[PDB]
Design a protein around this ligand. Structure first.
Ligand SMILES: Nc1ncnc2c1ncn2[C@@H]1O[C@H](COP(=O)(O)OP(=O)(O)O)[C@@H](O)[C@H]1O
Ligand SMILES: Nc1ncnc2c1ncn2[C@@H]1O[C@H](COP(=O)(O)OP(=O)(O)O)[C@@H](O)[C@H]1O
Ligand SMILES: [Mg+2]
Ligand SMILES: [Mg+2]
Ligand SMILES: [Zn+2]
Lengths: 654, 344
């Protein structure tokens, strides 16, 4: 009936349609009223924000137009939606006469957060006509400014009679009174602004490294600015992978701080309304690293969830899958189905993903269960696909190369902000990966200067800085997954291991597992691999007893969250016995990787990981035995001569 | 014209249909690449296949397999490698040409600078980013620095460049093909030394090429006559000497390649059986040669992937929806031709 100038929105039609959709819609559990229960749970718990999947609107017939209205005119539609939600809430509470205490709901505020806007084409592909629309983005957080106070109400005082006023901001402008509003006092221009008596809101700016799905020819990465307000501040940390929904904005900027002249070319940014921090293609963040942030989220009444929710049926399925007697082989085979065999490599990858148990001593002291692995072997094997897959499955991590890095580029640096024109501190690769896995390729090309900084990271999971202006110690709780190629052309089995890898022998002892990926010619294995690889081109799309990636991630995340194994004396005896065996066995030098205490630590970590898998809380003899077997098999001591340190190509099994 | 902007229409369709009707598309296109250079036919076929490319496959779970073909030429001085490099760079719509130490550091990859127009920071792409979805030609491949070699290594590996330095932590897109040229370590090739001792590059880097050609200069009173006749005729006039063959101009070649790039042939079962048998036989044979220290590199799964890519490229050039045995025949034929210079 009565539309709004500039738009086509009618308030009455929109509110009626939204109410009807709220009161009649089911997910077609799929036959029950979907949103009635969500509102009921909201009021039982007292939450104030409703997350609206905009895709749910395209299902109902009425709201096939409200979808486009929301995508085109978010400003009016969101306010209409909030008011309609409050009205529906009062109707629900009163129409059934539950409890006469309804003042709180009638006084508080509500809000709606769209979170499934359609697929976009990237920030840089937008045009001027797309300003003030609803869009979504993917990217990586880099920096965040401190909280900015943003005034909403100004407090004036009269300098002759103490009369005090209050003025509310109006589209970003304050109207200062030109005369005291008293009859006794009417002095003109006598009102002064007391800043400390004003009311301020919360504001912050985030720097985002966008990761669009489609990339044109010759396009390099860039950065974007995001504005978050009120309860969403401090909800993102550098290194987080996020999905964001917001409005596309523009604004002119002043040329200098003295004049009030503006520039014709505008500056673009995004106003955020919802942030998604979870996915079904990767593991959930390690909660042992965000202990205080969850508490702060609870204190701040922000409804962003860090970990995915679990249904009862999902937990039941998890238990049944964990109850079978082929669990280890099945889980290993699930990892990277497009990679053939490599049973022990995949077992090591799975154990690294699970991780060991973190001890935290009262009165100070920290042990961590991060597991480090080095991959050495013939150049043409599939040891970089592994790094790619592990990078894409993990929640945090950076994929670096040894020769294309630097000591400063991995730790921290200072840069001048192009907007504020001041100097700020940024993070390096190893701190951006805290709580995740850092993949290093061609580890043997890294300079000694560059390699120097890995010692502290792998020996205390921290880094120290002594630079101009900054002196502090940082957390580096990240796992290392490296790879190396042999000296020359191929791994020569007529020489010791230390004559094939271009690293100091002492360095090779700090890893938990070392793999020798050898390539042997056997017609059966060649036939198998060739058939496996040629089956992938039978049809234009992939179709390859394997669990789906979503269930695998859910299972591993649940196991990491909810199981914490502990070692027993039966395991202690075997641990000490095996360590003494390794130390004694092999006892004319630099022929083999000498055993050290790091090996005992590695056995502890691997046994804890094996116990943590399969939902056990106690480490036992089988766990330690499997850990020792895996450590021995990775370096394949079975085919090695204890005296000369050579390898027999006939005793090695594909 | 860019390939992505392709579109069928009466005008383009008539020219294309004429080209197919004339028959012998493969050799006719192959012989038109740098027609002022005598001989060098199989290298030209490999270059044409590098122009066309293979098929990119999305395997699922985020895994990725390239479809671009990398070719390396390495031979004695005065064999016209640079002419072929430059001609290929000129034919390609997004081609770039580089030579050794003239381009280094941020000349490759990208650097950080400030935009004059806008007040924001940006990255300017180097040689490897300017030729994205094109051909990157590298001359004097053996005289480069280690950092450039590592960058090329990664680009051939996974079509990306990772940088972690002061003020930059990002990953670039490098969907480009590599065409390199190199020289033996002592000038001319020395048949008294192992093949891996005649070159300065690591063996793995050489193994990372689909096709690796050896071009030696063995004097012969017969072929020298033909080469001299060709060159001196080319200098007397401005054209090539053959009259029974007409070369196709670059625009028509570009049009036909753009049309061919829209196809995506698929693997049947008999072709797969043939491929597995050939792979087994070749892999078994190569080990004995490499034990005698007479092989640039032992066969590995990358050889099988290169064979598959070349078969796909030939199928695409034929304008067919399926692959046949003859395509795999030609792929193996070329991969065998790659090394006659080492058996004379
Ligand atoms: N076991 C395997 N399973 C699947 N593909 C393989 C396997 N072994 C080799 N390949 C193929 O060979 C290539 C190996 O190269 P790549 O893994 O990049 O080398 P590296 O990782 O050793 O640097 C891949 O393209 C892959 O398709
Ligand atoms: N097969 C050939 N046909 C015609 N000209 C040739 C041939 N081989 C060499 N040349 C001539 O000799 C010169 C070789 O120089 P260049 O192109 O740099 O090759 P290279 O770098 O291999 O020496 C060129 O100018 C070219 O004209
Ligand atoms: Mg690789
Ligand atoms: Mg030259
Ligand atoms: Zn007053």
């Amino acid at each position: 009936l009565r539309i709004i100038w500039g738009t086509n929105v009618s308030i009455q039609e929109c509110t009626t349609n939204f109410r009807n959709f709220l009161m009649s819609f089911k997910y077609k559990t799929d036959e029950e009223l979907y949103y009635i229960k969500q509102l009921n749970e909201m009021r039982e718990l007292g939450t104030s924000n409703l997350n609206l999947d905009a895709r749910n609107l395209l299902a109902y017939k009425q709201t096939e137009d409200l979808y486009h209205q929301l995508l085109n005119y978010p400003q009016e539609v969101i306010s209409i939606m909030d008011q309609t939600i409050k009205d529906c809430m009062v109707s629900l509470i009163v129409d059934n006469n539950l409890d006469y205490d309804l003042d709180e709901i009638e006084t508080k505020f509500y809000k709606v957060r769209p979170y499934n806007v359609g697929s976009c084409k990237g920030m840089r592909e937008l045009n001027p006509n797309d300003i003030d629309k609803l869009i979504n983005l993917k990217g990586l957080v880099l920096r965040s400014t401190p909280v900015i106070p943003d005034m909403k109400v100004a407090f004036f005082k009269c300098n002759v009679c103490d009369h005090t006023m209050a003025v509310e901001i109006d589209r970003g402008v304050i109207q200062e009174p030109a005369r005291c509003e008293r009859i006794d006092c009417n002095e003109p221009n006598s009102m002064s602004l007391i800043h400390n008596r004003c009311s301020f809101a919360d504001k912050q700016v985030i720097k985002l490294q966008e990761t669009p799905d489609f990339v044109p020819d010759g396009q390099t990465p860039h950065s974007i600015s995001l504005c978050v307000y009120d309860e969403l501040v401090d909800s993102c940390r550098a290194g987080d992978r996020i999905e964001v929904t917001g409005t596309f904005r523009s604004i002119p900027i002043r040329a200098n701080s003295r004049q009030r002249v503006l520039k014709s070319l505008y500056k673009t940014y995004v106003d955020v309304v919802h942030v998604k921090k979870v996915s079904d293609k990767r593991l959930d963040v390690d909660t042992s690293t965000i202990e205080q942030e969850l508490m702060q989220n609870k204190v701040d009444h922000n409804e962003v969830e860090e970990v995915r929710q679990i249904t009862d049926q999902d937990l039941a399925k998890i238990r049944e899958v964990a109850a079978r007697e082929d669990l280890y082989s099945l889980l290993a085979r699930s990892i990277a189905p497009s990679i053939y065999e490599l049973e022990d490599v995949k077992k090591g990858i799975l154990l690294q993903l699970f991780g060991g148990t973190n001890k935290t001593f009262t009165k100070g002291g920290r042990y961590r269960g991060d597991i480090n692995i080095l991959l050495c072997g013939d150049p043409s094997t599939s040891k970089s696909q592994i790094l790619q897959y592990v990078h894409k499955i993990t929640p945090r991590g950076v994929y670096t190369s040894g020769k294309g890095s630097s000591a400063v580029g991995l730790t921290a640096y200072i840069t001048r902000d192009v907007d504020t024109k001041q100097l700020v501190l940024e993070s390096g690769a190893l701190v951006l990966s805290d709580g995740g896995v850092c993949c290093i390729d061609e580890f043997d090309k890294m300079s000694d200067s560059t390699r120097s900084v890995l010692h502290e990271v792998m020996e205390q999971q921290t880094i120290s800085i002594a630079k101009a202006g900054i002196i502090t110690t940082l957390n580096a709780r990240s796992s290392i997954l490296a790879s190396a190629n042999p000296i020359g052309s191929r791994y020569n089995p007529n020489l010791p291991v230390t004559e094939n890898i271009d690293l100091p022998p002492p360095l090779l002892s700090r890893f938990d597992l070392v793999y020798l990926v050898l390539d042997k010619v056997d017609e059966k294995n060649d036939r198998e691999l060739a058939k496996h690889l040629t089956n992938l081109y039978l049809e234009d799309k992939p179709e390859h007893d394997v669990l789906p990636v979503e269930f695998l991630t859910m299972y591993i995340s649940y196991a990491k969250e909810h199981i914490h194994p502990i070692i027993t004396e039966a395991a202690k005896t075997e641990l000490v016995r095996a360590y003494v065996g390794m130390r004694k066995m092999g006892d004319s030098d630099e022929k083999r990787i000498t055993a050290t205490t790091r090996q005992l630590e590695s056995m502890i970590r691997l046994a804890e990981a094996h116990a943590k898998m399969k939902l056990k809380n106690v480490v036992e003899l089988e766990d330690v035995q499997e850990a020792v077997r895996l450590i021995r098999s990775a370096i394949k001591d079975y085919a090695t001569d204890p005296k000369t340190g050579k390898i027999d190509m006939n005793l090695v099994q594909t | 014209k860019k390939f992505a902007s392709f579109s069928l229409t009466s005008d383009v369709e008539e020219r294309v249909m004429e080209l197919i009707t004339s028959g012998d598309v493969y050799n006719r296109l192959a012989k038109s690449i740098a027609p002022e250079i005598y001989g060098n036919l199989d290298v030209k076929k490999a270059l044409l296949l590098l122009l066309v490319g293979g098929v990119d496959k999305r395997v699922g779970d985020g895994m990725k397999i390239r479809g671009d073909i990398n070719v390396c030429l390495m031979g004695d001085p005065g064999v016209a490698k640079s002419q072929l490099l430059k001609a290929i760079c000129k034919i390609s719509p997004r081609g770039v040409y580089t030579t050794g130490k003239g381009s280094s550091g941020v000349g490759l990859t990208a650097a950080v600078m400030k935009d004059p127009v806008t007040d924001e920071m940006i990255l300017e792409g180097g040689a490897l980013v300017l030729a994205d979805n094109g051909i990157c030609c590298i001359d004097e491949f053996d005289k480069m620095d280690e950092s450039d070699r590592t960058a090329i290594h990664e680009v051939m590996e996974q079509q990306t460049i990772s940088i972690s330095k002061a003020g930059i932590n990002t990953t670039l897109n490098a969907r480009t093909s590599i065409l390199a040229a190199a020289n033996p370590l002592y000038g001319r090739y020395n048949p008294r030394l192992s093949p891996l001792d005649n070159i300065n590059l690591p063996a793995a880097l050489l193994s990372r090429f689909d096709i690796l050609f050896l071009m030696l200069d063995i004097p012969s009173r017969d072929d020298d006559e033909k080469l001299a006749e060709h060159v001196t005729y080319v200098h007397m006039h401005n054209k090539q000497p053959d009259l029974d063959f007409t070369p196709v101009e670059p625009s028509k070649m570009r049009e036909y390649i753009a049309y061919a790039k829209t196809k995506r042939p698929v693997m049947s079962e008999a072709v797969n059986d043939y491929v597995v048998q050939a792979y087994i036989r070749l892999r078994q044979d190569s080990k004995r040669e490499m034990d005698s220290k007479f092989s640039f590199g032992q066969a590995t799964p990358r050889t099988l992937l290169g064979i598959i890519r070349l078969s796909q490229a030939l199928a695409k050039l034929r304008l067919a929806d399926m692959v046949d045995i003859d395509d795999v025949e030609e792929a193996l034929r070329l991969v065998r031709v790659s090394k006659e210079s080492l058996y004379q």
